[PDB]
Design a protein around this ligand. Structure first.
Ligand code: CO
Ligand code: CO
Lengths: 484, 484
């Protein structure tokens, strides 16, 4: 393959496309013999050179990595998420879909097809692996063999056209809670709220509209509510006609937080929209209710964090204003006005990729993990935020822990592994990929989840480099068809 | 896996164990659209940590790499050679066989089993892929799927216990010509000469004895003869009982060249042994007859080239005396004495891994390629000879060509690809793996075989590193079950 000599395709961003199997990877330290299951994660990774001769990171085809940890060892299985895009392009021997979220640039032969790369999450639910991209229904795969099934539309019961890549699992029921924005077509203001039972059946789909179409990438869930931030990374058909990146950031629009009842009978008038000044947030650590209040914890930045989705008024990207810090947004359902009850920064540590012990989804919670950018640390190699620490916040005491991966490495999203179903919150392990940039390889690190400063208790070496990852998740073996 | 922190297992020698598939590898330049077939090569690569807690490079399990070149692209498929050793150890989850060529160190559970790692050659003949190790019968594999068949003993017609990893194909018949030393058991002085027809049937097996047991790694073949150098890298049960490496070099023993008739009716008295002073040679570029003379071209060194098989009298390894240079050994079957007719250095370039256009096997020939060690070139990274150039010798004119891979890379064995069945000698391409040590990755280089100084016409990037390789070979698609 002839790929462009551009940053999105070179160095740490060289295409990989490795499908492989390696059991019993070389490792150091002690892999807890308690562990029996797998960590799935996804990297965008281009099957073919881009039609336009360049592209962005978020547009690579999804390649799924599974780390099966059992018997004190770690194995890897890596396979493509075989979306319809992947299949059509594979058969044609070339790219057929064009630029990111831009159907105007697709070959006529694939007009009308799902454009999903399934590249944003590798999530386990209902005995399946969900390879997810928020512009289409999710793809599903067999978590044991990593073969691909196809797109999930729930027996026809889903009529929205899209499905999130940030599903939540409500611990009170085991339901998957999901949204789909642009639900009636590209750039539309329609959103669906979906709930899926543990058996994988769609329980309900509820439609509503938002203040303006924007990237609704993530959201929170509580017992009673969908908690949906409206942040003006905006897109439009006009931008696409003009050849601009689908999304751009508008610093002049307000930010909203919508509180949407988790109810099949939802009507638009049931929704409350709280409004605040312009800012940026993408991911949700967790949300929860307290009395008549709703709290959501997000990495908040002053301005846009996506340089590739630039300021709509032509401002150059501002890295300083892109620094995000975990912040609690609180709104009171009993309040008279549409003002937030409070916005409270929870840490001065800058970071992203927030995670919790997912058994706490929607509940008051003590612990949060993030990838941290500590700009005070020495750096000799980079591979444009520098995510160089694992961070743990204790909301009960305020205490913070940090682990630095050293001056030639960076880190990918952590994921929490519970010791047992009814172990206390945070009792378990963190796993995360470490980019060993000087060695052009990756490690999988295993930490004691509440004692990270001493470093990983085990380091699994991969004999190749992973690419930049998006989201990932642990599942125990019994949830994924792997051996007891 | 917990591997030793020793040189044989770290850095460029880290275990890899990658089984993978990647079509359409990222590449630069122009892969000749004429090419349709595959280059197979083998790397020793340990499935498990060694029983003794250390080991040598030559003892890793064979991992087979196939580069399928077609339609102007290159694909990779990498699979284990599943020897009985591999299978038994895989089932046990641990090493069961011990040190190199040392059955005394094996677990009792595998006494009597073939110890082959099938790690020295990946050769195509009779519709099969031969994964070869000279201490056992060859393993065979399906060249298309790279599944393993098992050990080849030719329907019981082979009674020798071993088979070479340096088979030759006689162009006059298409027969495979092979030896097996230590043919009646470890360290024995019995050798078999085998010839196998193009259909894979054993034609004959002829037994003989040699002046002393030694590493009979390679040999030459001409129309009438097996040409067998006897070089005193010697082994014995006594060395193994004392815990020494199987082989050690004895500078006090003579070197012989045996001329053995290629005849099923061979008797010991039919063999002529020519004798010369101590020196070292391992590989054969080619051998051929001229009148009553036999010529064989070998990289000759003053002394041992294997630091891991040390001087039997305790001398430290001498790198200067280990420098090998292509040299013609000529013996006259009509001569009165046992002296060689001549020993003539053919180049001052130091090198190893000699190759020809294999259509010239046993015939007078014009071209030879080698890996060259040019100690005058700058080096910033190494990964203990530094093989940093591809070398081409023209025996007709004397002309030499060199291509240097640069200061942070090294090279693996080249292989010649003919343009067509009746293309002239040397009309075609050279392929070879390049270790890009600074990038911790490998390239496959494609050269115009007689115009190497301009550099490769195509460079295929692998998104991971291969390990040190041994021998490899090209076959056209029709010889290996791949698409026309
Ligand atoms: Co996300
Ligand atoms: Co050899």
């Amino acid at each position: 393959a002839h790929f462009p000599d551009t940053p999105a395709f070179t160095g740490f961003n060289a295409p990989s496309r490795i499908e492989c199997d390696i059991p019993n990877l070389v490792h150091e330290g002690t892999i807890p013999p308690e562990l029996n299951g797998a960590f799935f994660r996804v990297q965008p990774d281009p099957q073919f050179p881009p039609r336009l001769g360049d592209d962005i990171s978020f547009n690579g085809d999804g390649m799924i990595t599974r780390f099966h940890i059992h018997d004190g060892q770690c194995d890897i299985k890596q396979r493509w998420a075989k979306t319809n895009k992947w299949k059509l392009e594979n058969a044609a021997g070339k790219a057929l879909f064009g630029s990111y979220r831009n159907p105007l640039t697709d070959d006529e032969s694939v007009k009308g097809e799902y454009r999903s790369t399934a590249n944003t999450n590798a999530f386990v639910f209902a005995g399946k692996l969900w390879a997810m991209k928020e512009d289409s229904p999710s793809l599903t795969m067999d978590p044991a063999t990593m073969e691909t099934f196809g797109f999930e539309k729930f027996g026809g019961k889903m009529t929205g056209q899209t499905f999130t890549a940030h599903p939540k699992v409500d611990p009170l029921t085991g339901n998957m809670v999901a949204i789909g924005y642009a639900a009636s077509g590209l750039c539309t203001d329609d959103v669906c709220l979906y709930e899926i039972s543990p058996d994988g059946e769609l329980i309900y789909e509820a439609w509503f509209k938002v203040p303006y179409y924007c990237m609704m990438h993530d959201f929170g869930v509580t017992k009673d509510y969908l908690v949906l931030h409206i942040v003006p990374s905006i897109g439009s058909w006009d931008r696409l006609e003009k050849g601009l990146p689908h999304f751009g950031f508008d610093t002049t629009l307000p930010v909203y937080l919508g509180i949407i009842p988790r109810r099949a009978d939802l009507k638009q008038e049931d929704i409350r929209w709280f409004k605040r000044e312009n800012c940026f947030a993408s991911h949700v650590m967790n949300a929860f209710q307290e009395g008549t209040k709703v709290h959501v914890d997000v990495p908040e930045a002053e301005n846009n964090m996506f340089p590739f989705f630039p300021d709509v008024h032509g401002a150059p990207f501002n890295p300083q204003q892109a620094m995000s810090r975990l912040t609690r947004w609180t709104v009171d359902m009993a309040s008279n006005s549409d003002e937030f009850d409070s916005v409270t920064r929870l840490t001065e540590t800058a970071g992203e990729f927030p995670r919790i012990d997912d058994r706490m989804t929607g509940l008051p919670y003590r612990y949060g993990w993030m990838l941290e950018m500590d700009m005070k640390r020495p750096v000799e190699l980079k591979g444009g935020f520098l995510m160089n620490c694992l961070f743990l916040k204790d909301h009960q005491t305020g205490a913070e822990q940090h682990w630095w991966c050293g001056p030639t490495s960076s880190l990918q999203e952590p994921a929490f592994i519970p010791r047992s179903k009814d172990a206390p919150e945070g009792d378990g392990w963190i796993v995360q990929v470490c980019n060993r940039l000087a060695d052009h390889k990756s490690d999988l690190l295993i930490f004691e989840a509440l004692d990270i400063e001493k470093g990983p208790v085990a380091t699994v070496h991969l004999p190749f480099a992973l690419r930049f990852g998006l989201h990932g998740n642990w599942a125990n073996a019994e949830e994924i068809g792997l051996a007891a």
